[PDB]
Amino acid sequence: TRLKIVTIHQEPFVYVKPTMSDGTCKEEFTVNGDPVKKVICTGPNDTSPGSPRHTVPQCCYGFCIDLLIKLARTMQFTYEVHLVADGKFGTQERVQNSNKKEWNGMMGELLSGQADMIVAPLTINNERAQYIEFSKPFKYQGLTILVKKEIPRSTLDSFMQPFQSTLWLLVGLSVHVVAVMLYLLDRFSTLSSAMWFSWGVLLNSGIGEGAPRSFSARILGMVWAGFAMIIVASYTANLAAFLVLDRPEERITGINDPRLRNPSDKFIYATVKQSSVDIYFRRQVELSTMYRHMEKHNYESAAEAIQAVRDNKLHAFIWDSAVLEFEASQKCDLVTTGELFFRSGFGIGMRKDSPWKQQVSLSILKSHENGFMEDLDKTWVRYQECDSRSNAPATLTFENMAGVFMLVAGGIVAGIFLIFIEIAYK
Amino acid sequence: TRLKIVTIHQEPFVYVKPTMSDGTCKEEFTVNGDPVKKVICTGPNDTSPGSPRHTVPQCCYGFCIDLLIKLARTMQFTYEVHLVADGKFGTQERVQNSNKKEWNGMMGELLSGQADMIVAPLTINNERAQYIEFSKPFKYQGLTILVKKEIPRSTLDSFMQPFQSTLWLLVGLSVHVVAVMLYLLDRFSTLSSAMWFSWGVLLNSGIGEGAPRSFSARILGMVWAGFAMIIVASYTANLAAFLVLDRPEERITGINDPRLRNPSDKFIYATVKQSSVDIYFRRQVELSTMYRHMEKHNYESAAEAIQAVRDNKLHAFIWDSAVLEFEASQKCDLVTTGELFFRSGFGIGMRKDSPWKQQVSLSILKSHENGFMEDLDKTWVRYQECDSRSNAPATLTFENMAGVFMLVAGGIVAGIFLIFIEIAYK
Amino acid sequence: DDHLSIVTLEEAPFVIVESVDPLSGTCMRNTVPCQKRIISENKTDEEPGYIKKCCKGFCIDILKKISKSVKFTYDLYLVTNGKHGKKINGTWNGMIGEVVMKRAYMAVGSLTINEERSEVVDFSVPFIETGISVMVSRSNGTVSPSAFLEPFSADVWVMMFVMLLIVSAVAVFVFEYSFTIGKAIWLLWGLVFNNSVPVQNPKGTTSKIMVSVWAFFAVIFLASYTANLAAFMIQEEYVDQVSGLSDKKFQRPNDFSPPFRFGTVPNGSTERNIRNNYAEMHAYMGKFNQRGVDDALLSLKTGKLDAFIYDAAVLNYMAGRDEGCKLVTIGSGKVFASTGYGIAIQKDSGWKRQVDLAILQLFGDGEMEELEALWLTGICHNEKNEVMSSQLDIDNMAGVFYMLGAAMALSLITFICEHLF
Amino acid sequence: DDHLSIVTLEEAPFVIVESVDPLSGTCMRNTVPCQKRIISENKTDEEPGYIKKCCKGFCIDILKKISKSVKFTYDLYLVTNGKHGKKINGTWNGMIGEVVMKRAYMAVGSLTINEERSEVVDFSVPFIETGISVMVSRSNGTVSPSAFLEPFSADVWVMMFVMLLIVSAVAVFVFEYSFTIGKAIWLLWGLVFNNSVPVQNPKGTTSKIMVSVWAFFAVIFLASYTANLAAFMIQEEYVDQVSGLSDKKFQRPNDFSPPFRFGTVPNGSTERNIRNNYAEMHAYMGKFNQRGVDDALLSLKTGKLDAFIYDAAVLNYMAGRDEGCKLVTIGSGKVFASTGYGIAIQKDSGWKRQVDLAILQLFGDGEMEELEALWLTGICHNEKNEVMSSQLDIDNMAGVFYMLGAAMALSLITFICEHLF
Ligand SMILES: CCCCCCCC/C=C/CCCCCCCC(=O)O[C@@H](COC(=O)CCCCCCCCCCCCCCC)COP(=O)([O-])OCC[N+](C)(C)C
Ligand SMILES: CCCCCCCC/C=C/CCCCCCCC(=O)O[C@@H](COC(=O)CCCCCCCCCCCCCCC)COP(=O)([O-])OCC[N+](C)(C)C
Ligand SMILES: C#Cc1sc2ncn(CC(=O)N3CC(C)(F)C3)c(=O)c2c1-c1ccc(F)c(Br)c1
Ligand SMILES: C#Cc1sc2ncn(CC(=O)N3CC(C)(F)C3)c(=O)c2c1-c1ccc(F)c(Br)c1
Ligand SMILES: C#Cc1sc2ncn(CC(=O)N3CC(C)(F)C3)c(=O)c2c1-c1ccc(F)c(Br)c1
Ligand SMILES: C#Cc1sc2ncn(CC(=O)N3CC(C)(F)C3)c(=O)c2c1-c1ccc(F)c(Br)c1
Numbered sequence A, B: 001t002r003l004k005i006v007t008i009h010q011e012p013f014v015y016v017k018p019t020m021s022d023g024t025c026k027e028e029f030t031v032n033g034d035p036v037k038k039v040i041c042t043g044p045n046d047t048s049p050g051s052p053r054h055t056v057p058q059c060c061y062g063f064c065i066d067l068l069i070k071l072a073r074t075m076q077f078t079y080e081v082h083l084v085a086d087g088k089f090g091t092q093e094r095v096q097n098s099n100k101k102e103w104n105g106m107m108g109e110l111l112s113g114q115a116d117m118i119v120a121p122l123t124i125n126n127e128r129a130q131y132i133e134f135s136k137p138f139k140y141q142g143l144t145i146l147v148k149k150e151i152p153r154s155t156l157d158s159f160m161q162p163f164q165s166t167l168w169l170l171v172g173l174s175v176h177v178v179a180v181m182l183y184l185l186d187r188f189s190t191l192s193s194a195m196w197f198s199w200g201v202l203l204n205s206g207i208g209e210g211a212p213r214s215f216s217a218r219i220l221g222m223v224w225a226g227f228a229m230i231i232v233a234s235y236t237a238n239l240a241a242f243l244v245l246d247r248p249e250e251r252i253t254g255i256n257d258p259r260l261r262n263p264s265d266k267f268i269y270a271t272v273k274q275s276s277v278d279i280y281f282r283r284q285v286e287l288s289t290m291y292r293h294m295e296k297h298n299y300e301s302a303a304e305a306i307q308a309v310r311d312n313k314l315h316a317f318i319w320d321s322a323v324l325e326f327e328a329s330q331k332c333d334l335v336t337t338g339e340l341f342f343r344s345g346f347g348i349g350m351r352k353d354s355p356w357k358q359q360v361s362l363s364i365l366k367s368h369e370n371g372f373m374e375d376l377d378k379t380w381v382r383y384q385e386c387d388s389r390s391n392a393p394a395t396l397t398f399e400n401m402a403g404v405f406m407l408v409a410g411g412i413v414a415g416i417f418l419i420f421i422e423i424a425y426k
Numbered sequence C, D: 001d002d003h004l005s006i007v008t009l010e011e012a013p014f015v016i017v018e019s020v021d022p023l024s025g026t027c028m029r030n031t032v033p034c035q036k037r038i039i040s041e042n043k044t045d046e047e048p049g050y051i052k053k054c055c056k057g058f059c060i061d062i063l064k065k066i067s068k069s070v071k072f073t074y075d076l077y078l079v080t081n082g083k084h085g086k087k088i089n090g091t092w093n094g095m096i097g098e099v100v101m102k103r104a105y106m107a108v109g110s111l112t113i114n115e116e117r118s119e120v121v122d123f124s125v126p127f128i129e130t131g132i133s134v135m136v137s138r139s140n141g142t143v144s145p146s147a148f149l150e151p152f153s154a155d156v157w158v159m160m161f162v163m164l165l166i167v168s169a170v171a172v173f174v175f176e177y178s179f180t181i182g183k184a185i186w187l188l189w190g191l192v193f194n195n196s197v198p199v200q201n202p203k204g205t206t207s208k209i210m211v212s213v214w215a216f217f218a219v220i221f222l223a224s225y226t227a228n229l230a231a232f233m234i235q236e237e238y239v240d241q242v243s244g245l246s247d248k249k250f251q252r253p254n255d256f257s258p259p260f261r262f263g264t265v266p267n268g269s270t271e272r273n274i275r276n277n278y279a280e281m282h283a284y285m286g287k288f289n290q291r292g293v294d295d296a297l298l299s300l301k302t303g304k305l306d307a308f309i310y311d312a313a314v315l316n317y318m319a320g321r322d323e324g325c326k327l328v329t330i331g332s333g334k335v336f337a338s339t340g341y342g343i344a345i346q347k348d349s350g351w352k353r354q355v356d357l358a359i360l361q362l363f364g365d366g367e368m369e370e371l372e373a374l375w376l377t378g379i380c381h382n383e384k385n386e387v388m389s390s391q392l393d394i395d396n397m398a399g400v401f402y403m404l405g406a407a408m409a410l411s412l413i414t415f416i417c418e419h420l421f
């Protein structure tokens, strides 16, 4: 009857929020007018409690919580939820240079009898299945890679970019030189109407109808028209190659990239300490070589890892698809790429002598066939705030075309000065 | 002393030419003024005997022949060369439903004592090494894929392609409609100078300086300028996407290709009957599934296979790199793609009891260290007649821009008629 | 003893059967033998056939390396009474019919894990996700009519025509201090759209400077408009035929256009789940059931059947191995019921623990993720987006004609508005 | 007995050594340990260190699978006296020193097959091609000055100008039946280069038809010129520093600019071949030799050494594992002496046939081609051509200024030609 349950914080599965007022949080409803069921979590104030080592009665809600409530009504049992203090899923280590091996996280407490039921996105694994028996997977998934995409390194922050600044000068100086030779080849065979041909052939403004008169200057004007076309067409083609950069460099395709084989200064990637991905990394034959790299980059939890990915602190992150995909759906700056490797789902582990393995497995299979957790998928993680912008050319927003507006605006404010100068000229 | 040698015809290694006059061919020299050494070949005319069912004397020359002459002066032996009648490298088969397995091709005669030395680009293989002992590889190579490239299926055979022919009509009909409304909205608020604005805004010919006068027709003229820009810019951008067809250079990438896993009606590929690649197909675990396919497409020899690749009869071919690379260097229509899988070089097989294995191996290693066959590589297969700048944008030849020339020419011939019509008009 | 028999069903790429070599008379290398039961001699049962079959695939290779993991030998034979298993009249059939009648003690194949199949036969750890999926000849192609305005968002277009009014309303300020606003709008706008039109240029020296600093803006506008243009005019947005199982179409097939022809293969787990969860759908779809998956594919291509519902993994495999990418599962691979391929075991047996720990090292060491690509991979499984090298029909370029026709009618509206006012 | 020792040398990716686990004290899984001897106790020889290492790689795994192929156990240990082997004073060293003094009976590593190493120690079938290769920091970048004429070949450009001559010479024929040829050249040509310039249009109705059928040609000309343009103005043609070994630079290092700093690792097969084939080169390059490949890479990056000659496979491996693609082998992977990595055996031993068949079974079943990509692969292994997303400098766009300068001078030539004639 009385059951103790440990849970880890995972945004698409376990939403943890400290309770206020008396210790009971609100009863906010979903988009479709449905109540967000809550459970009590006598969990640590912060991960790795340390100095604020207090068991705050927070409230938890999410996919796993609704699965717990369904199994609670079906199985007729009482339960309590308390977060794991270390905040890790669980790996096998040893202490004091002893032969015996000790577990961490969930199995550091469930194996000690402190927890009866485990309800968390715990990936099924050999080392995990040796000590506890997992039920059938309630959500099949595989590991995936989340990239930064904060800067695709082809960002037009200026429209002067297509040319480099010692070519803008030498295009804007080669105008006056050719003007002051059109004028001289015509004079000795006007200056304002030569300097106007010279420009209005470049910009294609068609302004200034003076054409070079003398046969010497028509050759130079013809070739200056050719130069103007090639200059402007190179600006245009190079701007396009900057914008048609909808295919950003080489995206990592699964765990196949040679850059993943070898650590490098530029490329850094890691996962959560003492997690399933660490066991997979040490459990892969080729992956022992670069195990040195992420050992210094591994994060304590996935939340701050994803925060690092969002900023310019981590390039690529590896984690379960059910988490990274949801995070990429909530935020447009982060997307995931690469084939889903290690197609191992989650599951509910059970003790060796626990008389509930068969019945809990049948319960979750029944929840599968009746479509209960399909409804949970639509309710909990189906927002899809972003769009499948990949394989689709982007649309140039404002602030993505703001420079040309500032160009014409600055031309106006300079003109109101130039008009004073011109009236004063006469 | 007396040694019998069998050889197969392979263009980059073995050039075979039926001799004329008394039975000796020419003594033509190389580009650097060096004689092309020849040897006698009592092989069958036109591959299989057929009507010329006789081993007609011929002259053979090439990489293997020069290696033979070098080993001839070193080892002090006499030799004769005669081509294999079946024209195959050799595989293990059985006849009369007997338990015993029989060899064909080279080992169908060398194992019978008919041949003492084997000199041919025979790939080293397990089934090949069980019956004879191979020397050290004198040219290391791997299997590669030659694609057709005769038609990349993005061939501009007209400049009218970027638009489909029921959009050219509807662009060339929407000119007259908008002209005969510019004229009417101006008349009732000229026809030739409306019909001239209407065109010279589309083509950007800037011809006809009449601008719509009345406020009703300036709106329609403004929007017709917008329509003209979008139409011409779509023609231009779609022509570019037709010409910037550098991407179709991405083709089958090695054996690891999903289209190679499964046979299909469009995709056909095969190799030479009773060759090393056939064994590799049956020696590969996954390659037994589609082994049904090329069994009906496999060719008797690589020469006609490459001829089929050149035409629209074979799409992809698989063979040794030292052959397909040379063929792709001689002809621009054929190129090779994909990683070099099965990196197994050639070699000189030896009989089990023949007392020349060690000394011949030392001889070829000596030829390696002194750079003799490096000179042979430069002499025999180093022509490089084709451009190696793949992923370099192409240059539009004539016959690749001939249509616009015919367009302006046809405009001239139609104008000499229209001028008669115009003088008659008044 | 460690010797236990294995049973399988010839279905899906997991179980592909080949015969013996005509010259060798045996299975190929690295191929475990297979046996299949035969019946002949009219009403009575004939003598056994003992045919030498070679049934392999993905699940068979999984069986191979788990057998090497646990160090047991085995033999393979095929079910003939039933294919998947139905508890008809209280008697199990097919796979479960064999397992409940022993003589196999094991079962490897395309067997779906569910509560009904688990109450009598426990299953191991699934090695691949699967479930229910609807695949159709999903096709259409709807180029959005306003694809010629997509290069910029609405903010930018509207701000372009506000800057144009601002600039033309000052170039007749920097030009006063016959060129009115009606000609500064017609100039400042004929530069945006190349410079094709006949304009009336200013004449003051500080106003040509403004026309020039605007012609540079026009150059950047047409450089950034046409950058992607022939990829917006060719981008087709395919509309999925059915939103999902619980859509209004499947709930009430009759009160719509002639109902979708959708069915499955009867006497299977897929029909087993649907009859429980949606019996009203089952009553209608019983008439559209078909014998095998090949019949379903042929029916969909011919068009008599316009939707198919079946196991997720098999349909995903068949989608990528079709002539063209016409056939594809609904929801881009959406599964409406998550299950897995398990291994059927007799209850209360110690082999289940060994089998679970013998499947999981394939996940851990990742030596079967390559096996995933070894067989279950198709051409259409990778796709080539929606852009191609295709001509532009009217269908593509018909948001430009709508705009031209709309101005062709607004010009006449304002024409009569002149002639009256 | 089937138990035989294996000896190796810590070098190349084929032999990468790892230490013991601090918590476990053993090598990792699927790891065969290694052995090594240390020298201590001042002048005398101390006891061996007996530190058991974990040395693996692309050769060690082949050793594993051939160990299961022939069913033999073994142990691994490293050479202490010598690295590769030199017959100095008639005594073999290193690998050959161990093999000829027995107590090894085997040798796995990056041992180059050659006649000198084979006369005393026969080698098996090589499992990977290799040889001699020269790698440098070959990277300058030279955009061809006439990259603005590349969009069309010279044939097309010249035919364009002859058409512009024979069209302007008829538009002053369809127009004479003040618009002379001097203005039909200036019109017909101002349409090719957009329509920027001020022209003087015809006035006859059949001549505007010709200007229009020419403006359509101009539209196609600028659509097919600028199609690839920003990929021709960015395409850099890297010039390789050294054509080959037999170039005039290596033959006579002194009679040129300060001679190239090229060397190798002494006491190896690479130096062994070069001293025989080119002793004059050997005399000069003896002063530039360095201890190890890492020293060579650091020297090349720092610039003190400007060329390195070594084994082909190792240099190929190091090329793809560099910060940037600055370091690249000469000839795009050109090898001037084809050899292979074999296994050293004692002469007249029956294990050679077994080893050859075991090696060739990997070629046959193709289970090591994936092993080729498992380790010997780098970032720079797939260069992204020469085009990138790069600005256009004055280096790129300087065939347009040469043409403008050439006309800037031809206009003055024809100016004086007017003012005299
Ligand atoms: C008599 C008749 C007169 C007619 C007059 C007509 C004039 C019309 C022309 C207008 C264009 C001029 C706009 C000036 C803006 C300066 C931008 C700048 O400094 O920043 C950039 C550096 O800039 C460079 O790279 C240097 C460019 C030098 C000036 C160019 C002169 C020649 C232009 C040749 C024109 C040929 C056109 C060919 C077609 C393509 C970099 O940007 P950033 O790092 O983000 O810094 C922000 C900039 N900010 C500080 C301003 C915020
Ligand atoms: C009063 C003022 C008058 C001014 C007059 C100015 C006129 C200047 C305009 C000139 C362009 C016209 C050239 C005609 C060539 C016909 C080509 C043909 O038939 O073949 C193609 C089919 O063609 C089609 O797809 C149908 C096109 C219908 C005619 C287009 C009219 C509207 C053009 C709208 C123009 C808007 C431009 C927008 C900017 C892009 C296919 O080619 P193929 O299969 O290889 O067959 C070989 C063809 N051959 C048989 C000829 C060898
Ligand atoms: C001050 C200022 C700012 S904020 C800004 N934000 C975005 N962009 C991009 C842009 O306008 N693009 C046009 C495109 C499609 F090519 C990309 C800018 O250019 C600027 C400028 C800017 C830059 C160069 C300038 F010369 C001037 Br004036 C202003
Ligand atoms: C008769 C005839 C021929 S032979 C020919 N050979 C090649 N090309 C290609 C071409 O000119 N291109 C311009 C590009 C870069 F876009 C590709 C042709 O167009 C033609 C025409 C043709 C085609 C349509 C026509 F309308 C006319 Br009139 C002639
Ligand atoms: C004058 C003028 C204006 S005001 C305006 N305001 C909004 N939009 C776009 C829009 O509403 N949407 C894009 C969407 C469908 F996503 C939503 C415009 O295109 C214009 C034009 C316009 C555009 C092209 C032209 F060619 C011409 Br003329 C005018
Ligand atoms: C008038 C005129 C002519 S005649 C001519 N003949 C040959 N070529 C190219 C050429 O020789 N080669 C391309 C190569 C370097 F591969 C060999 C030309 O470019 C021109 C021009 C021309 C070209 C661009 C212009 F902008 C102008 Br104005 C004139």
Ligand SMILES: CC(C)CCC[C@@H](C)[C@H]1CC[C@H]2[C@@H]3CC=C4C[C@@H](O)CC[C@]4(C)[C@H]3CC[C@]12C
Pocket: B219, B223, C145, C146, C149, C399, C402, C403, C406, C407, C410
């Ligand atoms: C530019 C001034 C003169 C106005 C004339 C152009 C106007 C009327 C144009 C500009 C954008 C055009 C629209 C662009 C988008 C759509 C949505 C599509 O589902 C049908 C076509 C439709 C509805 C077009 C109708 C006409 C339209 C609104």
Ligand SMILES: CC(C)CCC[C@@H](C)[C@H]1CC[C@H]2[C@@H]3CC=C4C[C@@H](O)CC[C@]4(C)[C@H]3CC[C@]12C
Pocket: A223, D145, D146, D399, D402, D403, D406, D407, D410
């Ligand atoms: C347009 C006419 C009147 C005169 C100008 C000629 C222009 C178009 C062209 C013709 C061929 C061109 C040359 C083609 C090739 C090279 C070789 C290179 O090492 C320097 C640039 C240079 C020399 C180019 C300069 C520009 C050039 C001289």
